[PDB]
Symmetry: C6
C-alpha cells in the first residue's frame, strides 16, 4: 500500500530500516514472518508466483497449491482493498507476491539473515556471478552452508545437463515457492535459461522482494555465458537492479567480492572473501565499507 | 474538448496560464479540484487508469474501484459527448484520465503546487534522474517533505528488491490512482519496468496530465540503469518530454538542477539545489 | 475512383489544379465543401476515421457519431460502388476518409486556405518541426490566428503533461474529426505520442488527404525529441511524405522556413518567416520561389 | 500448371516468347485476353486479389465484386484441378491471381504493350524510381499518355496528402483490379505506404505477373524516400525482382534510363529518355541494347 | 525409424550407400520407387507436404489430393507406429514427407539420377545460385534437358513477374508434389519468397530428403537478389546445407562449379561445367 | 524436488557424485534405471517430451505413446506432489522430462556410460562440433560403435537432404524418446534445423538432463554452418551450457578434443583423440586432465 510521511515519521522509518540490518539479531525477521504465516486461517492463500505463460499459481502456508478459492476481499488502513480468487488452479483475482502482510509498515529493509566470518549478510536475492575461472556452483553451496549455520540449506536445481536436474520452468517456480515458504537459506543452481517468457521476466523482478519480505536469502548462480551483448546487458541489469546483494569473482583465484544493499536509500557495503578447495571440490570460505555508485558500475563491466 | 480562439481570447488564456504558476496562491488549484471532486454524486466515476494489459480500471471520488456502472452520457458545450460504462471491473466505454471536468476551460497550465527555499514548484510530474553518485531515493523523499510543507506526502513503492515492495504493475496503478485522488504531494520510488507493456506505455503518457489537472505533484525517481553509457541522454529528454519538470544530478556531488515548464508555450525556468546528508542518510535541501 | 485522360483532358486538369492554389479566392474551396456537407440527407455518414485498434468510427455532417446504419450502396460513373454500414458504433463496411464526394473530378489539389503577409497558404496538413531553440507551440498558435484571419481557429490538445490535456488517442481522433467538419483553421498541439498502433499509423497517412479534400488546414507541432534513429526517420518521413506543407526552424532565432506543395506534380514553393515575442510568450509573425528535391532533403537532415 | 519439355519443345517456347515482345503487333496480346474475358460465362470469377488482412476478394469479367459463389472445380490437361469458392464476400477456395486461363501454354512472356519514339515497351509492371530532382509524378503521366497512344490511360491514386486521394488499402486493390480488367495502360501514383501488411506484400509479388498475363502495363511511381536501410533494400528488391521493367532517373536533369526484361531467360534491354516541361508542369518525352546483371546492380545502388 | 548398428552392419551400410551413387545404374532407384508407389492401394496416402499456414495437404499415388481419410495405423519392426488421418482436406494425424516406405533400410543415400558429359549426378535437391552475370534460368533448363536424357523434364514456375506465372505458395507446393510423384527430373524456376512463412520453412527443410528418397532430382534457381553484397555467402552455405548438390557460377562467364554430396558421411565431389548460348538464349552444356 | 544439506550430508553427496563417474562400473547406472523402468505398473507414464508447438507427448516404459490417462497424484518425501494427466494424446498436467524417479537423492551426476581406449566417457548429451575439414558424421558413428562396445548403438536421423531422412520435428522427438527408453548409446545425426520453435528450445534444454538421468549417452553432430552471429552464439551456448560433454575438431586433421563435465561442481576433464579413415569413409578412433573455464572459452571461439 502507500504510506504517508513528514520529517519525523520519515526519520523514524530510516532508523528502523537501519536497525533491521545492522542491529537486529540475525535471522530474527525470518522467525517473525514464520510466526505470521503459521497464524493464517489454513487454506488461506499466502503466496502467488508466475508460471511460464504469465499466469500465476497460488500456495497456502504449507506450500500446498490451491486450486479453487472463492472471491474474498480485505480492506487495509490505506482504504485500499485487495481481492483474491483462484479458479481451476490459477489466480483469477489478486497479484503476484505475498498475499498476506508480513512487513506491516516496516518496508524498504534488507533484514539481516545471518552472520559469518565477522560479516552480516542480508536476506533477499543474492546473485553469484562474474566471468572467470572461479566456479559459481562450489561458491553457492559453501555460502549456503555458512549462512545456514545451525540449519540446513535448501537446494533448488534447474536447467543443467546433469542427472536429476529439472528443466521445466513450471516445476522450477513450484520448488522456489516451497523453498521460500519453508527455509531461511536457499540455493538456486543456475539462473541460466531464465534471464524471454513472461514467467521468467516476472520471476526476475519479483523474487528479490519476495525473499526480503520473508527474511530468507536466495543464493543464485548465474554464468555470463553468452557474450551476446543483448543478454550480457540482461545479466548486468539483473545483477544491478534485481539483486539485494551481489557476489562477484575477481582476477585473483579463489577471491570474491560481496556488495550488499543495506536498505532503502541506505549505503551499499562491500567486503572480500577468500576461499580454497578441499576434497571432491568442496569449497571452504575462510574467516579472519561503502562503495560509490561509480565504483559499482566499474564492477559491472567485469561481466561485460 | 476543442477550444476556439481569436487574438483577444488567446491573449487572455496566456495571461491566465501565466498567473496559474506565477501569482496564484501555492496549492490553491489542488484545493479547488478537491472541492469539485467532493461535489460528485458518489459511485460516480471520476478517474480511469490503464492496467498492464491495456484495459482500464475506474475509481470514484473515494478511491473505491467501480466494478459495475451502466452506460451514461454527458453532452458539453463543444457539442461533443462523453460516455462511461464499467462492466465486470473494466471500462467498456470511456477514456483514460479524469472522467470529470476539473480544469474548466483553463487548460495548458502548470498550477503552482508549493513554494520552498525561495522557489515556486509546479504540479504535474517531476522525474528525478541522471547518472552519477548522487542518490535519487534520498532526493525524492527530501523533496516530498519540503513540498508537502504542513502536509504529509504520500509514498508509492514499486519494483525494488527490498522488503514490502510491490512488484505487480496492476497494484502499482491502483496505488497511484488512490494517491492522486487523495494527496497533493506524491513520491514514486522507482519507475522501473515502465520505460514495454501497454499499461506501462499508457502510464508514462498519462500521468503528467492527470497530475497537472488535479494540481498535485508526482515526484518519480528513474535510474538510467539500463546502460551506464551516455545513453543517460536517452531516458532523459524522453523524461523531459513526458515530464512537467525535470530534476537531474550534476557533476558536483549533492548538487541538482531543476528545469520546470511553467505552462503551455511559456518559458522553461531553471534553478539549482544544494543538499547534504544527516543521520541514517536523511537528505536535507539547503535554503538561502 | 479512377480517372481516364488523354493529352487534352490532362492539360485541363493541371490548369485547374494550378488555379486551385494560385488564383482561386482564399478559402473558397472550404466554403464550397461546407455547402456540399450541408446538403447531405442528415444521418448520412460523411467521415470515417481510425481509432487506436485499427477499427473506424463514423460521423454525420454535424460531427455527431453514428452508432447504427444499415448497409447502403452507391454507384459512381466509374461503375464502381461504395458501401457503408455501421454496427455497434463501428464501421462494418466502407473505408477511412470522406464518405461523400467533396472534390468531384478535381483531384490532386492543395486548395488555397488563406493569404497572409503577402503569401498564399495551402490547406491540408502542415507539420511544424525542427530541432532547436525556437518553440513550436507559440508558432502554431500564431499561424493559426494569422491564417484564421476573420475567423477563430480551433485548437486540439493532445499528449502533453499540462492541465486539461487529453492523452487518450480515441478522444483525440474524435476532436480531430469534429474540428475538420466544423472549422477552416485547426491547430494540433503535439503530434508526439502518435508517430506504433494501427490507429496512429492510419491517422498519419490519412489526415493530409482528408484536410486537403475539405479545404481546411491542420497545423501540427512535432518535436524531433528522441534522437533514436528509428523515429528520427519516422519524423523526416512524416514531414517529407505525409505533409502538404512543412514549416521548419532555422539556425537564426525566430526565423522559420515554409515549404509548400502547390499540387499534384506541381512545384514546391518556399518562403521565409520572421517572428518575435510579446508579453506572456505571445508570438507575432512579421509581414513585409521553387526549391529542388535535393535542396528539400538538405532541409530534412536538419531534423536528423 | 506445370509444363514438360525436351530440346525441341523448349526451343519452340523460346522462339515464341521472343516473338511476343519483338515481333507481335503492339497491344495484340491485350486485345486477345480481352476476348478471352468476354467469352466468360458471366458471374464467373476471373480475378482474385489480396486485401490488407491477407484474405482475397474476387471479381467477374465486368469488374464487379462477387460475394457468393458455390464450390466449382476444373481439371486441366495437367491433370491438376483448380477450385473456386466465394463466401460472404471473400474467397474460401482458390488462389490469388487470374482464375481463368489467359496465356495457354505460352508462359514466361513480356507481351509488347506499345511502341513509342522508336522503342517497344513491355506489359507487366514498371516501377519509376530513383533518388534525385527529377519528379516521378510528371514522368508516369507522360509515359501513360505516350503508351496509351490512341487510347486514354487509367490513373489510380493512392496515399498522398492531396485532395481526393484515397488512403485506404482495400479501396486501392479494388481500383487496381478494375483497372487491369478494363484498360491497357494504367498509372499508379505512389506505391508509397505499400512497400508490412500481408496485403501489401501479396500485391508487390502478384501485380507484375497479373499485368503481364493480361497484356496491360502498370506504371507505378516509387520514391526511395526514407533512407532507412531496411526499406531502402525493399525498394531495390521490388525494383530488381518484382518489376517487369524499370525506369530510373540519372544524374542529368530530365534524363531517364529504361531497363526492360524481354522475357523468361531472355536479355534485359536498356535505352534512354530525354524530357522537358511545358506549362503547368506537363512533361513531354522527346522522340528522336543489353545490360549485364553486373551493370544492373550498379544502377541499383543509385537508390541506396 | 531408428536403426541399430555394430562395426559389421555399419560397414555394409556404407558400402551400399557408396554403390547407390557410384555403381548402380543411373535412374534405377527412381524406377524402383516408381514400382513401389504403383503397388499402393489407390486412395492410400503416399505424400504429405506443408502449405503456407503450416498445415499439410495429402496426395495419393496419382497426385490426387485426399480430402477425407479415416484414421489408420501401421506398426513397423522398430516397434514404432505411424498414423495417418485426413479431415476436411488437411492432415489431422501423420507427418510431412513420404507416408510410404520407399527406401527400406537403405538410408542416407544420394541415389544416382543420371549420367552426362562423363559425370554422374545425384538425385535430391540441386540449388543453382551465385552472384554475377551468368543467368540461372538458362542453366536450370539446360541441366534439366541434359539430365532428363531420353525423358522430358518437368518445369515448375513460381514468383516471377512474367505471363502465366503462379505466385500463390499453395499452388506451388501442389505443383511440386505432383512433379515428384510423376517425374525424375524437375526444374523449379525461382525459389523466391522461400528463403518466412511456416510453409516456406517446411519446404526448404523437406524437399531435399523427399527428392532423394524418390530418386528424382529437383533443380532450383535461387537468386541472391536480397542484397548484392558478398552476402551471397549467406543464402549460399544455407543452400549448401539444405541441398544435396550445389551449382554456383564462377568469375569466368559461362563457367559453373558443381559440388555434390555422394552420401551420408561420404566424400563431396566437385567438377566444372562450360557453357554457351545459341539462338533465343538456349544454353548448351559442353561435354568432353 | 528440493534437497536439504549440512556440511556432512553435502560432503557425502560430493563423494557419491565423484564415484558415479570415476569408480562405478561403466554402464551400471544405465542397467539400474532399466530396472526401475521395468518395475513400473504398465501403462504408467514415464517420459514426457515437447513437440514443435510446445505441448508435450507422453510415453510408457515400452516407448508406446499414451493418449489418455486420468489425473493421478503422488506425494514425495519433499512433501511436494506431482500430477500427471494425459488427454487427447497430450499432457494436460505434469512436466517435461522423466515422470518417474530414476535418481533418488543421487542428483548432479554424469554417470559413466562406457570406457574406451583408456578413457571413461560420461552419459548425458555430447555435442560433436567445430569448424573445419574434419567431418562430424563419421566421428559420431565411430564414437557410437566404440562406446557401444558389446552392444549396438541406435541412430536417429534428422534434417539432411539424403534418402530416408525424416525432416518433421514431431517424428524426431518420437525417435529420441524411444531411443532413450531402449538404448544406452544413441547417435543423432544433425542437430541442424533445431537450434526457433518452442519444441526445439525445450529439446535443447531438456535432453542433457534426460540422458544423464537415464545413464545413456546421446552423441549429436552440429555444424556451425551459418556464420550468422545470432546462431553462431546459439551454437557456442548449446555447446557450453546444454552439453554434458563436448567433442570439437582441432587444426590438425583427424584430431579431436574431448571436454567432459564429471559432475555437479566437479572438474571438467579433457583428453585428445586421433582418427583415420578406412574404406567407404569408415572412421576409426585409435587407442594408445583439467581445463580451466578460461581455457574452455578459448576452445569456444573456434566455432565463432
Amino acid at each position: 500500500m502507500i504510506h504517508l510521511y513528514d520529517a519525523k515519521s520519515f526519520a523514524k522509518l530510516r532508523a528502523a530500516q537501519y536497525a533491521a540490518f545492522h542491529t537486529d539479531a540475525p535471522g530474527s525477521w525470518f522467525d517473525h514472518t514464520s510466526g505470521v504465516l503459521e497464524s493464517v486461517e489454513d487454506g488461506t492463500p499466502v503466496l502467488a508466483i508466475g508460471v511460464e505463460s504469465g499466469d500465476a499459481i497460488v500456495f497456502d502456508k504449507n506450500a500446498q497449491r490451491i486450486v479453487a478459492y472463492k472471491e474474498k476481499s480485505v480492506k487495509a488502513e490505506d482504504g485500499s482493498v485487495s481481492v483474491v480468487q483462484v479458479e481451476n488452479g490459477f489466480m483469477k483475482q489478486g497479484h503476484r507476491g505475498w498475499l498476506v502482510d508480513l512487513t506491516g509498515e516496516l518496508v524498504g529493509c534488507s533484514p539481516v539473515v545471518a552472520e559469518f566470518g565477522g560479516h552480516r549478510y542480508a536476506s533477499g536475492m543474492v546473485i553469484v556471478t562474474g566471468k572467470g575461472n572461479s566456479g559459481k556452483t562450489p561458491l553457492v553451496h559453501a555460502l549456503g552452508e555458512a549462512l545456514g549455520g545451525k540449519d540446513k540449506y535448501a537446494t533448488v536445481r534447474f536447467g543443467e545437463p546433469l542427472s536429476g536436474y529439472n528443466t521445466d520452468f513450471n516445476v522450477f517456480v513450484d520448488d522456489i515457492a516451497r523453498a521460500m515458504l519453508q527455509h531461511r537459506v536457499i540455493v538456486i543452481d543456475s539462473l541460466k535459461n531464465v534471464i524471454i517468457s513472461r514467467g521468467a521476466f516476472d520471476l526476475l523482478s519479483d523474487i528479490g522482494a519476495m525473499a526480503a519480505s520473508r527474511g530468507c536469502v536466495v543464493i543464485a548462480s548465474l554464468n555470463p555465458t553468452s557474450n551476446d551483448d543483448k543478454i550480457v546487458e540482461l545479466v548486468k541489469e539483473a545483477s544491478r537492479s534485481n539483486s539485494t546483494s551481489l557476489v562477484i569473482s575477481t582476477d585473483v583465484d579463489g577471491e570474491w567480492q560481496v556488495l550488499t544493499r543495506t536498505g532503502e536509500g541506505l549505503q551499499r557495503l562491500t567486503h572480500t572473501l577468500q576461499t580454497s578447495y578441499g576434497e571432491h571440490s568442496v569449497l571452504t570460505i575462510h574467516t579472519s565499507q561503502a562503495s560509490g555508485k561509480a565504483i559499482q558500475t566499474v564492477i559491472k563491466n567485469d561481466e561485460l
